[PDB]
Amino acid sequence: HHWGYGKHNGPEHWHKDFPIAKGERQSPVDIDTHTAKYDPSLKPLSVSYDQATSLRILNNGHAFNVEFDDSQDKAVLKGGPLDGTYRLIQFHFHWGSLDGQGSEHTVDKKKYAAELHLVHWNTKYGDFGKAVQQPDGLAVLGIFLKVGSAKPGLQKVVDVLDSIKTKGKSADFTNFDPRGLLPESLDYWTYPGSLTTPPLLECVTWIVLKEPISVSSEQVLKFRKLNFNGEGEPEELMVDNWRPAQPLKNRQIKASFK
Numbered sequence: 473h474h475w476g477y478g479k480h481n482g483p484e485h486w487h488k489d490f491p492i493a494k495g496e497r498q499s500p501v502d503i504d505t506h507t508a509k510y511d512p513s514l515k516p517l518s519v520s521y522d523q524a525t526s527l528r529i530l531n532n533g534h535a536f537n538v539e540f541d542d543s544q545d546k547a548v549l550k551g552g553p554l555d556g557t558y559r560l561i562q563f564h565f566h567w568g569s570l571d572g573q574g575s576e577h578t579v580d581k582k583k584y585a586a587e588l589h590l591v592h593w594n595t596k597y598g599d600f601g602k603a604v605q606q607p608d609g610l611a612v613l614g615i616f617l618k619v620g621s622a623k624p625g626l627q628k629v630v631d632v633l634d635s636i637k638t639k640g641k642s643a644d645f646t647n648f649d650p651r652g653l654l655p656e657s658l659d660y661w662t663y664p665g666s667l668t669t670p671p672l673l674e675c676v677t678w679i680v681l682k683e684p685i686s687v688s689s690e691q692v693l694k695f696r697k698l699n700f701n702g703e704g705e706p707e708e709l710m711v712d713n714w715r716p717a718q719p720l721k722n723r724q725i726k727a728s729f730k
């Protein structure tokens with residue numbers, strides 16, 4: 473009886489196995505744009521993905537992950553609110569059953585159709601597993617998706633999804649350039665939070681871009697053909713794999729922009 477996104481094992485149940493679910497710095501949150509304050513001290517944000525080396529794409533039963541070779545300093549996030557260098561390890565998405573829902577963060581209570589999470593770990597902790605035990609261990613770059621024009625740089629991901637339909641399937645996925653998933657502007661909001669899935673560790677500096685990317689209805693419809701189940705098990709479509717907004721508690725959301 474494992475955690476998931478069903479009626480019986482969804483986000484409102486997670487606190488029984490993961491009591492930190494009711495903690496002081498849980499994610500995602502609603503971003504109240506009028507209450508976020510411009511912080512002129514944030515340093516410029518630096519996304520350096522030219523040398524990123526993708527390895528594989530995996531259906532883990534909760535989302536699909538594009539994983540990167542993080543054995544050297546190639547693809548790094550620095551600057552913004554961050555002290556030091558954070559290395560890209562994987563990206564994944566959260567999405568809805570309908571275009572009106574799917575994002576984890578919300579903006580003035582608006583839900584986007586999906587949200588991209590580019591996950592990075594702080595190199596001062598040596599490995600990912602050590603980093604997630606630290607309050608500044610991870611930096612996750614979050615990018616909203618809206619439905620409209622296709623995102624050409626997403627299509628290579630869309631086209632491999634038929635080969636990883638069910639939980640536990642993986643496929644080779646080399647030479648994918650995650651710069652093709654970024655919007656034009658790097659304006660962002662930032663706050664201290666958590667993983668949005670169990671174990672819900674409070675180790676993340678969240679950096680949420682203000683500008684959504686546009687993807688086509690056909691691209692997101694292909695996300696919604698994935699399965700939560702394993703092969704040979706009753707089919708359950710992988711949709712609504714998002715945690716709703718959590719209490720902000722004693723936190724301030726900072727804006728990089730006026």
Ligand SMILES: NS(=O)(=O)c1ccc(NC(=O)N2CC(=O)N3CCc4ccccc4[C@@H]3C2)cc1
Pocket residue numbers: 539561562589591600601612666667668669
């Ligand atoms: N929704 S979110 O952005 O808040 C979020 C939620 C969970 C994770 N975890 C992650 O990307 N994992 C978990 C992990 O232990 N390893 C173990 C080490 C290892 C090694 C290679 C590739 C991936 C991994 C994964 C990475 C991160 C972010």
Ligand SMILES: [Zn+2]
Pocket residue numbers: 564565566589668
């Ligand atoms: Zn995520």
